[PDB]
Amino acid sequence: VKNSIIWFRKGLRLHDNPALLEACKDAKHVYPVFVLDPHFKVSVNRYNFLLESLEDLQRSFQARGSRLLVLRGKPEEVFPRVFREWGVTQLCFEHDTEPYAKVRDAAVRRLAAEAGVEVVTPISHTLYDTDMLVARNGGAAPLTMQSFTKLVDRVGDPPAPAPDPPAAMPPPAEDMPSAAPAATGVPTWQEVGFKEPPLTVFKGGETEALARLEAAFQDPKWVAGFQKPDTDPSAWEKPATTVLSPYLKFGCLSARLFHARLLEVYRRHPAHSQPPVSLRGQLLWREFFYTVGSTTPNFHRMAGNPVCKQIDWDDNPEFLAAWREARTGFPWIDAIMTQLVTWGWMHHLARHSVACFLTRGDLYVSWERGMEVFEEHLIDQDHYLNAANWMWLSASAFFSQYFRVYSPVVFGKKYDPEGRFIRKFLPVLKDMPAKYIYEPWTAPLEVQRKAGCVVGRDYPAPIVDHAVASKACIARMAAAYRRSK
Numbered sequence: 001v002k003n004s005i006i007w008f009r010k011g012l013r014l015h016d017n018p019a020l021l022e023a024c025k026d027a028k029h030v031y032p033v034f035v036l037d038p039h040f041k042v043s044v045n046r047y048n049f050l051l052e053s054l055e056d057l058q059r060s061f062q063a064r065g066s067r068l069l070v071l072r073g074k075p076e077e078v079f080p081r082v083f084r085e086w087g088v089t090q091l092c093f094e095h096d097t098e099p100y101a102k103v104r105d106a107a108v109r110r111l112a113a114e115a116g117v118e119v120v121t122p123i124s125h126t127l128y129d130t131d132m133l134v135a136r137n138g139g140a141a142p143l144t145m146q147s148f149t150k151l152v153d154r155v156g157d158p159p160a161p162a163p164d165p166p167a168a169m170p171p172p173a174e175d176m177p178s179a180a181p182a183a184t185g186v187p188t189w190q191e192v193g194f195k196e197p198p199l200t201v202f203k204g205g206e207t208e209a210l211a212r213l214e215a216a217f218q219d220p221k222w223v224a225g226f227q228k229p230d231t232d233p234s235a236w237e238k239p240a241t242t243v244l245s246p247y248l249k250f251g252c253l254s255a256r257l258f259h260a261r262l263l264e265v266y267r268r269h270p271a272h273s274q275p276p277v278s279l280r281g282q283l284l285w286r287e288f289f290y291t292v293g294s295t296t297p298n299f300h301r302m303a304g305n306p307v308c309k310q311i312d313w314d315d316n317p318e319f320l321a322a323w324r325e326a327r328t329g330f331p332w333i334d335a336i337m338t339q340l341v342t343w344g345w346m347h348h349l350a351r352h353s354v355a356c357f358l359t360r361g362d363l364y365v366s367w368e369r370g371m372e373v374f375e376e377h378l379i380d381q382d383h384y385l386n387a388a389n390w391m392w393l394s395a396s397a398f399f400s401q402y403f404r405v406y407s408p409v410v411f412g413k414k415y416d417p418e419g420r421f422i423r424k425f426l427p428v429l430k431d432m433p434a435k436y437i438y439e440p441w442t443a444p445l446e447v448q449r450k451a452g453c454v455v456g457r458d459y460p461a462p463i464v465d466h467a468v469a470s471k472a473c474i475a476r477m478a479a480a481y482r483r484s485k
């Protein structure tokens with residue numbers, strides 16, 4: 001008989017899950033598995049988001065006669081056991097192009113073959129088979145968004161979302177010891193070792209992802225006319241973009257479903273925005289960075305990375321600490337960095353502000369250091385997207401216009417002159433008059449005292465003078481660029 005495992009890593013969804021559909025086909029028993037390495041820096045925000053995503057999967061599987069098995073251990077150690085215990089003949093999982101995934105998945109494939117297990121690994125985390133895209137482009141990934149968009153337009157539409165799985169699923173076999181409920185339940189953030197609770201406002205799981213998708217498409221005119229660079233990074237009550245990145249990162253939402261819904265709207269709105277600024281463009285940025293990242297060695301590092309300029313970043317731990325701890329003395333910067341740690345998500349241009357500040361803009365700290373801080377706190381932390389955008393923002397790859405430097409004072413003021421965003425994430429400045437809220441060190445001491453926010457006592461003074469720092473950084477950047485002629 002056919003006993004299959006559908007192994008969840010990303011692709012934490014029932015919809016558009018060809019791995020799942022295959023595992024269920026003609027199956028007597030299906031074991032939906034997630035492998036939790038229990039000795040696993042990572043914020044509780046992201047880890048709890050994953051846990052909530054597993055809980056959602058548990059509910060969906062229980063609604064269909066099955067249940068999610070959260071196995072504790074390393075895959076190489078767990079799968080050999082359950083292959084034989086469950087008499088498994090087929091192992092299915094969504095393909096993953098991350099470096100670790102290639103190593104892990106190769107090891108699992110070898111073990112599967114030893115046990116006579118058929119391995120099926122469809123593509124469904126990305127819009128396209130990214131290796132096919134590289135092959136269609138003559139064997140090398142495009143290195144600009146312009147050429148990437150021309151490639152995908154020549155390739156055509158991505159595959160349609162896979163059908164929904166059956167309303168009843170073949171369950172796991174009863175009395176299998178490795179499937180005992182007490183050993184295979186979804187843990188809470190407390191049980192895995194976290195002491196502080198999650199603070200983010202975005203709940204994980206496919207069910208939330210689909211609801212947020214529908215909310216975004218409630219206004220097709222907004223979807224059609226979406227222009228990413230025109231959106232407001234200070235909007236926090238109702239974020240100006242979809243906030244689907246956490247759900248796309250974990251696969252709670254299919255990118256192909258997202259794309260297909262976009263085309264349905266675009267068909268009815270002929271003036272809809274186009275790439276790169278359109279909502280479809282945003283999925284293409286993701287596809288672009290996955291394609292280049294997956295084919296580039298050491299993509300997440302500077303040294304040994306062929307696409308990354310070698311820059312003489314300062315090893316300045318005090319500057320890094322100040323930025324990381326939201327005490328730069330620039331409320332716009334510190335507010336965004338507070339949003340990072342509390343929500344684990346910020347608007348793209350808020351990420352621009354803090355990343356430019358840390359790297360080529362002001363502090364001249366390496367983008368690898370900023371990426372590590374983002375990697376800890378972002379609930380949408382994505383290996384390729386985080387690396388690519390950090391290289392972009394530091395002018396190390398893809399982007400080279402290092403004379404464009406965001407002001408940590410003026411940038412946010414264009415959107416939010418009252419500083420409502422600052423007042424939300426930095427309550428110490430709640431009473432500061434708007435005239436000074438972006439530059440509190442310029443307020444008269446009487447204003448500071450009346451506002452209950454004395455610079456140097458309640459809120460730090462700026463760690464740099466932007467005018468002086470940005471001029472020095474641009475000088476260093478120009479030098480670094482001449483070095484790599």
Ligand SMILES: Cc1cc2nc3c(=O)[nH]c(=O)nc-3n(C[C@H](O)[C@H](O)[C@H](O)COP(=O)(O)OP(=O)(O)OC[C@H]3O[C@@H](n4cnc5c(N)ncnc54)[C@H](O)[C@@H]3O)c2cc1C
Pocket residue numbers: 228240241242243244245246248249279282283285286287289346347348349351352355374378380381382383385386387389390393
């Ligand atoms: C320094 C820095 C770090 C970043 N780190 C991450 C990260 O770890 N994970 C992540 O998903 N994005 C990352 N981004 C990209 C971007 O900031 C987020 O994808 C976006 O802010 C998420 O909001 P949204 O879902 O509302 O995006 P929308 O505008 O609604 O876009 C829809 C989707 O398109 C994709 N997308 C959008 N913008 C980009 C982009 N610039 N690059 C790649 N894909 C994009 C995401 O999957 C996103 O959910 C980073 C950007 C910068 C500058």
Ligand SMILES: [Cl-]
Pocket residue numbers: 228229276277278281
């Ligand atoms: Cl854009």
Ligand SMILES: [Cl-]
Pocket residue numbers: 405406407410411
């Ligand atoms: Cl600016």
